[PDB]
RNA sequence: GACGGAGGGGUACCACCAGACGUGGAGUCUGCGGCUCAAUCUGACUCAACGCGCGCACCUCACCAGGCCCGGACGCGCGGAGGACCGACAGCCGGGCGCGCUUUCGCGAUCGCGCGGGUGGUGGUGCAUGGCCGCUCCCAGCCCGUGGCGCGAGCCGUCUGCUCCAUUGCGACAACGAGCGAGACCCCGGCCGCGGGCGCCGCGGGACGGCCCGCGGCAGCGGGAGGACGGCGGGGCGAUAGCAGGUCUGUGAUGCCCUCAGACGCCCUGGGCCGCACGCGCGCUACACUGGCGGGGCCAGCCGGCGCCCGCCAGGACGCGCGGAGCCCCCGCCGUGGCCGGGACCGCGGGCUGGAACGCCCCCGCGCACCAGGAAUGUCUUGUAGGCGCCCGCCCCCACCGCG
């Protein structure tokens, strides 16, 4: 079995959604020698816009921040086994799964 | 520089027996102790060597108040990353003093000896909650604003 | 420390979020009248699987299902989608009184035909009040009747308009119905104290000795 | 180690006096005319500025060692800011040509043998520079 | 000092009298864990619970000192 | 015809993405969305006031 | 205004086949992807955004195609009344069906 | 209700006091006012306008000087296909654009008209009005049911006691129960634990006014110790009610009203907002001696790539993916000299990038004012003031600005 090393990376806005997808990949992978999950440093996406559409008033500013957390899972398996794992993993719509060979 | 695995990343083998953290003003100094021949070197650098020479006298405070028999023989290798310059020295001072405390270990009243050092210097065993604050809209600095034209 | 800060996908994920805002706008453009309430696309397997949570699913299919994937086909010109690779999950949204965007359409569509503004708003308050919502804000504004704001607010419950938890039990729906005189603005709100997946901070249930 | 125990100021000043007897590097004329940096107010008056810089690069090099320091790297040890403008000063680099000569000349003496991303000391040089430090402390 | 709202004191008042059992009179530690049986009250955040768990130590102390 | 000088100028003609406005493109992260336009479309992209 | 009859008839067909169009509006010179055609010289060419809009608007103005506008985009949804008029221009046949006419049913 | 050179209490470095750094005085810059111009596009104008509407060589761009171009959809009435439209080498005019000429060439209803209608528009009215925001507001009040009191306007609870930043409570009360604000909640630290991990990063817990002593009807209230931390961490979200506050000049937010093809439509070319006594509204750098200027020990936290080779740099080539501040601290050089203080104005070059400098940087002149700032002002109590640097927003170019 040409055991390729696959790096699985998950970037998602909500910590509550991210932990659930992370748990499924760890849960599905106990049979396939899965390395434990790597938590990324939070990726801040701050945007600061003065709230007022017009220029009136002491410009007050909206700091709008989007937090990105990415999760690294190393797996040594066949090309099919990740596909069998896929049916079991609970798919949250819009969360990203990245297969890095 | 920032909370890494730099705690022991630099040294491989020769496991240094003691690991003691010292922190002042965003400066991290993990103290590694091997109980050698009077090596108090921190940052792989001599105690006498310092950024401010005058400041070194403050970092010799456990040495003067606590028995010198402790510093007479010891071994040290400290990874200090972060801090402007003087932040590093107090963090170093927190590290080494806690490192001497970790060495005392077995005597139950280790705290009683250490408190002579707290009485002479408080915060020599304690970490301050003082951290930089933030600016707000209309403010050049954290606790100011653009000078107001009309009351 | 050895990984590129040029992580290309880190930018890609936000592109999906503008895709989500564009999808929200896409369905807001005419499918909000068809009932569109909420959207979620899935490009993880390049399925482009989109859930259109909507008040009534049958409107887009019509009578032949011809336009059902035409919405995906409209996205096909934009994103090279294939009919059936992409999917539209237009399903049933229950307790539509809780839904806000279409609830306020239900009211300003009635006000397009022209009917007592007070009466129309009051019936809207009751049909969501029936759903267990103590307060629904039928805030209207704009050039109402006599020229001026003549803003009228209609509220029936203890809605918290302030606080981080406020957004949990509340929704906003910005809607404008244009009389020949001009834009009449309506912002709507809803009450959900019993979230059932989380707890309102103030709610102390209490207990007894026996 | 005693190379970390020789204070940086003492190491650098003492090393260049025998480097003067050595005849190593050979500081060129245009470099001793030019003012170091693109932010310096006016030329340093050290006269033997190039020779004194040469004792400055190879000491910081001992600590850098295997990781390596490129041409920008030694300019970093002496990085300064302009002190004369009506508007505020944004930090800028020192002169690249003078720095490029100091470690390129050091490659020539075989104390520094480099072939990696920018420059590394030949072991013979690391040992010899450390040996000058061995003389300096004790 | 700290002064809390009617609901916060009233929840504590309900907890100390309507389910007295033996909430602690002078000790904070039992009180810290005796207010979380789930049925006795449901509220989010440890500190919010701790607000009831603060007054309860005085209310039970008051009852021990004399009738409230 | 007009094609000879038609839009001959070559320079950025960048516009706000959601709107047709030209100012405040705000291409910080490649979001070519508008600034006044951004307030109407921030939560959907995942940014929040916190 | 010179709009090729080959640009016209092939363009009508692209819209007819998918019953859809999503174009970021372009004020002036543009090339619309998804629609390609054959010039009098036998060259494969793509049409122009200025020209395409002038026909797109005309078919929604005829009422043959329903259209939406989301700030700077045209979303075209073809009508059944429209399909008959498209056949009256393309010289194609009634049996031919738009590709989304059926098959998106989800169980 | 609102006022009050009315009283009785509260409270806030937007109030003040003990202090601090200021600003106003100096130069310089940016934004106004006021001028000038073909044109200086404009909105704002006490806090709550005036480095603000997210970086004008062009575009933006609103304005000025010049011109091209239709993009007058859809229906009928026409004109009418070898005749609707539309392109054109030279010789031009003309920066120029086959625009329109001389020209002699190509097209092929794809359409031109007439109408009715669509047609855009940073064009007016924000006292048509949406949305959103400024303020009232370092600021706590709001209202409902039932019952009371009043012919009623309204009262009562919602309070002439105490406490709290705060109807914040605790007591007491023709009110009695509810609520919405404030709280709670959320975001980041003070610390630790569990799983882990590359990127130390996800999940829990924990300082509770808990306890001590004094007072407290009691709520609270000081003095205290343990203790990561003392009784909100640094932040956000913020009631009812308003304002004829601001924005039609962000918009598929738009009403009325205008310009609708010699256009207020839309493209090009050159302007202008970078003009401009004095006056201002922020800023910035100075006046040196805790300062210089000095080589030469350095040090970060935002969270960030480097190498090599020529070139003083500016930069340029050739490449590989990879990495950090200033002040200060060093020894020195240096007399109180508008100084080797300061860095202006401005000759001479080297470049950058851009269609294009009128943008900018570096090198080398040069050494403006200014030698401690009059009234009158601000802004702030610990990691705070100040001092000193980094990054971003915009942007080919360019920060003194702002968020950090």
C-alpha distances in Å from residue G102, one per residue of C79, C85, E64, G62, G90:
21, 15, 80, 25, 22
Burial bucket for residue C56 (CB in 10 Å: 0-12, 13-18, 19+): middle
Q: How many beta-carbon contacts under 8 Å exist across C and E? A: 36
C76-CA/H133-C1' distance, Å: 39
CA B105 to chain centre: 19
CA pair distance D128, D111, nearest whole angstrom: 8
Q: Is residue D136 part of a domain?
A: no
Query: Two tokens at B88?
Result: 């590093």
Q: Report helix, strand or coil for A99.
A: strand
Query: Two tokens at D42?
Result: 């006016």
Is there a single domain that holds both residue C104 and residue C84? no
The residue written with tokens 């102790």 in the block is B33
Share of chain A residues as helix, strand and coil, in percent rounded to the nearest 5: 30, 40, 35
Count of other CB atoms within 10 angstroms of residue C174: 12
- State which H helix or E strand residue D125 sits in: helix D123-137
Backbone angles phi, psi at C11, to 5 degrees: -65, -35
b/e burial code for range C191-201 (CB count within 10 A of at least 16 → b): bbbeeeeebbe
Number of independent structural domains in chain D: 1
Beta pairing class for C87-90 and C49-54: parallel
The residue written with tokens 């979380």 in the block is E36
* Cβ(C48)–Cβ(C81) below 8 Å: yes
Q: Is residue D65 part of a domain?
A: yes
Partners of A39 in the β-ladder: A71
Beta pairing class for C173-178 and C183-188: antiparallel
Contacts of G23 in chain C (CB under 8 A): 77
Nearest CA distance, F11 vs chain C (angstrom): 25
The residue written with tokens 């482009």 in the block is C48
Q: Domain range for residue D26?
A: 2-131
To the nearest 10°, report the CA torsion of B54, B55, B60, B62: 140
Nearest CA distance, G73 vs chain C (angstrom): 10
Is there a single domain that holds both residue C36 and residue C117? no
The resolution of the experimental structure, rounded to one decimal in Å, is 4.9
Nearest CA distance, A1 vs chain B (angstrom): 35
E60-CA/H172-C1' distance, Å: 24
Q: Is residue C46 part of a domain?
A: yes
Nearest CA distance, A92 vs chain B (angstrom): 32
C1 CA: nearest nucleotide by C1' = H199
Q: Which chains touch B (3 or more CB pairs under 8 A)?
A: A, D
CATH number at residue C60: 3.30.300.20
The residue written with tokens 């002190």 in the block is D83
Residues 6+ apart with CB under 8 A from D121: D58, D61, D62, D65, D111, D112, D113, D114, D129
Q: Of C33, C61, C92, which marks where a domain is finished?
A: C92
CA pair distance C178, D17, nearest whole angstrom: 90
Partners of C87 in the β-ladder: C49
Q: Is residue D25 part of a domain?
A: yes
Protein-covered nucleotides of chain H (CB closer than 7 Å) are 14-15, 22-23, 27-29, 43-44, 46-50, 52-55, 58-61, 67-71, 73-75, 85-88, 95-99, 108-112, 118, 121-122, 128-135, 163-164, 166, 168-170, 179-192, 195-212, 216, 218-222, 227-229, 231-241, 244-247, 250-256, 266-269, 281-286, 292-315, 320-331, 333, 342-344, 354-356, 361-364, 377-386, 388-396, 399-404
Is there a single domain that holds both residue C109 and residue C163? yes
**CA–CA–CA angle D103, D104, D108 (5° rounding):** 110
Q: Is residue D138 part of a domain?
A: no
Residue of C nearest to F46 (CA): C17
List the one residue out of A92, A77, A80 whose CA is nearest residue A22: A92
Q: Domain range for residue C134?
A: 100-191
Q: Is residue D93 part of a domain?
A: yes
Give the CA count within 13 Å in the CB-facing half-sphere of C40: 11
Beta pairing class for G73-78 and B76-82: unpaired
Query: Two tokens at B3?
Result: 């909370």
Is there a single domain that holds both residue C63 and residue C140? no
Contacts of D5 in chain B (CB under 8 A): 46, 49
Burial bucket for residue G107 (CB in 10 Å: 0-12, 13-18, 19+): exposed
Residue of D nearest to B50 (CA): D7
Query: Does A51 lie at the interface with F, CB-CB under 8 angstroms?
Result: yes
List the one residue out of C155, C175, C23 whose CA is nearest residue C89: C23
Contacts of F29 in chain C (CB under 8 A): 11, 14
With CB atoms and an 8 Å threshold, state whether G71 touches F19: yes
Q: Is residue D97 part of a domain?
A: yes
C159-CA/H148-C1' distance, Å: 30
DSSP H helical ranges for E14-45: 28-34
Is there a single domain that holds both residue C57 and residue C114? no
With CB atoms and an 8 Å threshold, state whether E41 touches C206: yes
b/e burial code for range F5-17 (CB count within 10 A of at least 16 → b): eeeeeeeeeebbb
Nearest to C21 among F29, F30, F44 (CB): F44
First and final CA of chain E: distance in angstroms? Answer: 22
Number of independent structural domains in chain A: 1
With CB atoms and an 8 Å threshold, state whether C14 touches F46: yes
* Cβ(B29)–Cβ(B1) below 8 Å: no
CA pair distance F41, D61, nearest whole angstrom: 53
DSSP H helical ranges for G19-105: 49-62, 80-90
Positive or negative CA dihedral for F16, G52, C27, C136? positive
Residues 6+ apart with CB under 8 A from A14: none
CATH number at residue C105: 3.30.1140.32
Query: Does A42 lie at the interface with F, CB-CB under 8 angstroms?
Result: no
Query: Two tokens at C99?
Result: 């839904």
C-alpha distances in Å from residue D66, one per residue of A43, C54, C79, D122, D124:
32, 63, 50, 10, 14
DSSP string, chain F: -GGGTTT---S-----SSSS--S----SSS----HHHHHHSSTTTT-B--
DSSP string, C73-84: HHHHHHH---TT
Residues 6+ apart with CB under 8 A from F49: A62, A63, A64
The residue whose CA lies nearest the C1' of nucleotide H320 is D117
The residue written with tokens 């000043």 in the block is D13
* Cβ(D97)–Cβ(D49) below 8 Å: no
List the one residue out of B63, B80, B83 whose CA is nearest residue B124: B63
Q: In what order do the strands lie in the sheet with C138-142?
A: C138-142, C183-188, C173-178
Nearest to F31 among C18, C20, C24 (CB): C18
Partners of A44 in the β-ladder: A67
Partners of B30 in the β-ladder: B21, B79
B128-CA/H230-C1' distance, Å: 14
E10-CA/H160-C1' distance, Å: 28
Is there a single domain that holds both residue C47 and residue C107? no
Residue of B nearest to D3 (CA): B45
CA pair distance B79, B9, nearest whole angstrom: 9
CA pair distance G68, G81, nearest whole angstrom: 18
C-alpha distances in Å from residue B57, one per residue of A26, B52, B60, B93:
54, 10, 5, 11
DSSP H helical ranges for chain B: 56-59, 61-65, 68-72, 86-104, 110-120
Query: Two tokens at A3?
Result: 């055991």
C-alpha distances in Å from residue B38, one per residue of B32, B79, C173, D21, F10:
13, 18, 73, 39, 72
**What's the residue count for chain B?**
151
Nearest CA distance, C96 vs chain E (angstrom): 29
CA pair distance C199, C201, nearest whole angstrom: 6
Q: Is F47 left (phi over 0), alpha (psi -120 to 50) or beta?
A: beta
CA pair distance C172, F12, nearest whole angstrom: 37
CA pair distance E26, E61, nearest whole angstrom: 6
Positive or negative CA dihedral for G44, G50, G55, G59? positive
DSSP H helical ranges for chain A: 15-28, 79-88
Residue of F nearest to C38 (CA): F44
Number of independent structural domains in chain C: 2
B135-CA/H49-C1' distance, Å: 24
Q: Is residue C71 part of a domain?
A: yes
Experimental approach was cryo-EM
C-alpha distances in Å from residue B80, one per residue of A56, B8, B45, B54, D8:
49, 11, 11, 20, 19
Residue of F nearest to C12 (CA): F30
Q: Is residue D48 part of a domain?
A: yes
Query: Does C17 lie at the interface with F, CB-CB under 8 angstroms?
Result: yes
DSSP H helical ranges for chain C: 8-26, 32-34, 58-61, 70-79, 101-113, 117-129, 166-169
Any idea what DSSP says for residue G101? G
């Amino acid at each position: 079995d040409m055991h390729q090393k696959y790096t699985i990376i998950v970037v998602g806005k909500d910590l509550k959604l991210v932990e659930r997808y992370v748990k499924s990949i760890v849960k599905e992978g106990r049979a396939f020698g899965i390395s434990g999950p790597c938590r990324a440093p939070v990726r801040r996406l701050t945007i600061t816009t003065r709230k007022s559409p017009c220029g009136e008033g002491t410009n007050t500013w909206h700091r709008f921040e989007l937090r990105m957390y990415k999760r690294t899972f190393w797996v040594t398996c066949g090309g099919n086994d990740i596909s069998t794992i896929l049916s079991k993993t609970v798919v949250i719509p819009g969360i990203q799964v990245t297969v890095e060979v | 520089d920032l909370l890494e695995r730099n705690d022991i990343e630099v040294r491989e083998r020769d496991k240094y027996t003691v690991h003691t953290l010292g922190k002042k003003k965003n400066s991290v100094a993990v103290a590694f102790v091997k109980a050698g021949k009077g090596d108090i070197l921190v940052n792989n650098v001599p105690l006498a060597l310092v950024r401010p020479e005058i400041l070194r006298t403050k970092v010799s405070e456990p040495i003067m108040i606590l028995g010198e028999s402790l510093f007479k023989g010891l071994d040290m290798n400290i990874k200090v990353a972060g801090g402007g310059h003087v932040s590093q020295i107090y963090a170093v001072r927190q590290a080494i003093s806690r490192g001497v405390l970790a060495s005392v270990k077995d005597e139950a009243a280790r705290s009683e000896l250490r408190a002579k050092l707290v009485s002479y210097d408080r915060q020599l065993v304690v970490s301050d909650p003082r951290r930089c604050e933030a600016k707000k809209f209309g403010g050049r600095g954290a606790r100011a604003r653009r000078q107001k034209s009309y009351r | 420390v050895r990984r590129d800060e040029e992580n290309v996908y880190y930018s890609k994920y936000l592109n999906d979020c503008i895709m989500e805002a564009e999808l929200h706008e896409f369905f807001s453009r005419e499918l909000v009248d068809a009932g569109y309430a909420s959207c979620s696309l899935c490009r993880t397997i390049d399925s482009i699987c989109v859930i259109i949570q909507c008040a009534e699913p049958e409107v887009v299919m019509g009578d032949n299902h011809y336009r059902l994937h035409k919405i995906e086909y409209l996205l096909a010109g934009r994103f090279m989608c294939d009919p059936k690779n992409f999917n539209i999950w237009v399903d049933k949204i229950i307790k539509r009184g809780l839904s806000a965007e279409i609830m306020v359409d239900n009211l300003r569509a009635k006000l397009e035909e022209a009917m007592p503004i007070r009466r129309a708003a009051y019936s809207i308050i009751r049909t969501a009040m029936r759903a267990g919502a103590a307060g629904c804000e039928v805030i209207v504004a704009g050039k109402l009747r006599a020229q001026r704001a003549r803003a009228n607010k209609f509220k029936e419950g203890c809605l918290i308009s302030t606080g981080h938890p406020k957004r949990i039990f509340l929704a906003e729906a910005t809607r404008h119905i244009k009389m020949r005189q001009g834009v009449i603005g309506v912002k709507v709100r809803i009450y959900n104290p019993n979230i059932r997946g989380a707890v309102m901070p103030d709610k102390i249930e209490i207990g007894a000795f026996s | 180690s005693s190379v970390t125990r020789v204070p940086a100021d003492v190491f650098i000043n003492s090393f260049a006096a025998h480097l003067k007897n050595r005849g190593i590097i050979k500081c060129p004329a245009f470099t001793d005319y030019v003012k170091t940096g693109v932010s310096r107010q006016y030329a340093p008056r050290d006269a033997d500025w190039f020779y004194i810089k040469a004792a400055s690069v190879i000491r910081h090099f001992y600590i850098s060692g295997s990781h390596s320091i490129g041409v920008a790297g030694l300019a970093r040890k002496y990085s300064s800011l302009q002190k004369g403008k009506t508007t505020p000063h944004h930090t800028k680099r020192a002169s690249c040509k003078v720095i490029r000569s100091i470690v390129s000349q050091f490659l020539g003496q075989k104390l520094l043998i480099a072939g990696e991303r920018g420059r590394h000391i030949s072991p013979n040089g690391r040992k010899m520079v450390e040996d000058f430090a061995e003389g300096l402390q004790k | 000092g700290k002064v809390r709202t009617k609901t916060i004191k009233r929840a504590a008042r309900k907890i100390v009298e309507n389910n007295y059992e033996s909430l602690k009179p002078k000790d904070f530690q039992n009180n810290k864990a005796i207010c979380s049986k789930r049925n006795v009250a449901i509220i989010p955040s440890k500190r919010l619970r701790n607000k009831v768990a603060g007054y309860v130590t005085t209310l039970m102390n008051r009852v021990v000192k004399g009738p409230v | 015809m007009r094609e000879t000088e038609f839009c001959t100028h070559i320079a950025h003609k960048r516009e706000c993405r959601i709107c047709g406005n030209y100012n405040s493109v705000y291409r910080k992260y490649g979001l070519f969305i508008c600034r006044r336009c951004f307030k109407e479309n921030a939560g959907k992209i995942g940014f929040v006031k916190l | 205004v010179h709009i090729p009859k080959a640009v016209y008839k092939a363009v009508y067909a692209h819209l007819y086949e998918n019953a859809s169009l999503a174009l970021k509006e372009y004020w002036r010179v543009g090339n619309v992807p998804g629609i390609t055609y054959v010039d009098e010289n036998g060259k494969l060419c793509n049409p122009t955004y200025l020209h395409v809009n002038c026909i797109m608007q005309s078919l929604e103005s005829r009422g043959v195609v329903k259209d939406t506008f989301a700030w700077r985009h045209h979303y075209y949804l073809l009508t059944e009344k429209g399909e008959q008029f498209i056949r009256k221009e393309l010289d194609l046949t009634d049996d031919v069906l738009p590709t989304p006419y059926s098959k998106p049913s989800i169980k």
